[PDB]
Amino acid sequence: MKGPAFEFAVAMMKRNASTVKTEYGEFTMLGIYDRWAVLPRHAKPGPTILMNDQEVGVLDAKELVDKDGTNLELTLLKLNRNEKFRDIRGFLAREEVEVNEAVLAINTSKFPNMYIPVGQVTDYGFLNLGGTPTKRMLVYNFPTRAGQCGGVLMSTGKVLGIHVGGNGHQGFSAALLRHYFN
């Protein structure tokens, strides 16, 4: 069923998600713990971002790659703000998870407070995303539109990944693994 996934998704977004603008567009951003949040790599945050229409400094940013050097399509960023995020690392899986029912949550000025039942999530692993070899790719059927990147892919009790791309038929998430936030 879908209800409990939506229930989890709405509560998660309310506590931990925000709308972010960089020079490269507008994205959903998920806070993970302390002042560390995650964005799609192609958001390419500069020294300042707009977070819920307010200027926020970036203290540090990390474009994640695997131990082999392969792109993961995620950027971790540390925000210059006093408030800490609710620690949601316990809702991240230690390995890539496949599910029969997932929900994708988007929150930007173009897609405010929207949730999409995406159905089955399949771990495709190593893929080529627009020329760039990328691994730990989760794939789901989705009539994708631009402006949805940073979307948070969830199932009941788990944050599975961050939406980083689409081709109009499938959507693609980078798996959000717990060890990224050691």
Author numbering: -1 to 180
Paper text:
Compounds 12, 14 and 20 were incubated with EV-B93 3C protease. The protein complex with 14 gave well-diffracting crystals, which showed the presence of additional electron density in the active site corresponding to the molecular structure of the inhibitor. As described by our docking studies, exclusively the electrophilic C-2 of 14 was attacked and covalently linked to the nucleophilic Cys-147, forming a stable tetrahedral Michael addition product. As a result, 14 is inserted between the solvent-exposed β-strand E2 and the loop formed by Thr-142, Arg-143, and Ala-144 and occupies the S1 and S1′ sub-pockets of the protein. Other than the reference inhibitor AG-7404, which is attacked at C-3 (see asterisk), the C-1 carbonyl oxygen of the ethyl amide in 14 is oriented towards the oxyanion hole and forms a hydrogen-bonding network with the backbone amides of Cys-147, Gln-146 and Gly-145. The N-ethyl group points into the S1′-pocket. The pyrazolone ring of 14 is sandwiched in the S1 pocket by π−π interactions with the peptide bonds between Arg-143—Ala-144 on one side and the Gly-164—Asn-165 on the other side. The cycloheptane shows only weak electron density indicating the flexible orientation of this part of the molecule at the protein surface, a van der Waals interaction is observed between the ring C4 atom and the side-chain Cβ atom of Ala-144. The modified warhead structure seems to favour binding through an additional interaction with the oxyanion hole and with the π-stacking of the pyrazolone.
Coxsackie virus 3C protease, like other enteroviral proteases, is a cysteine protease with a characteristic specificity for glutamine in the P1 position of its substrates.
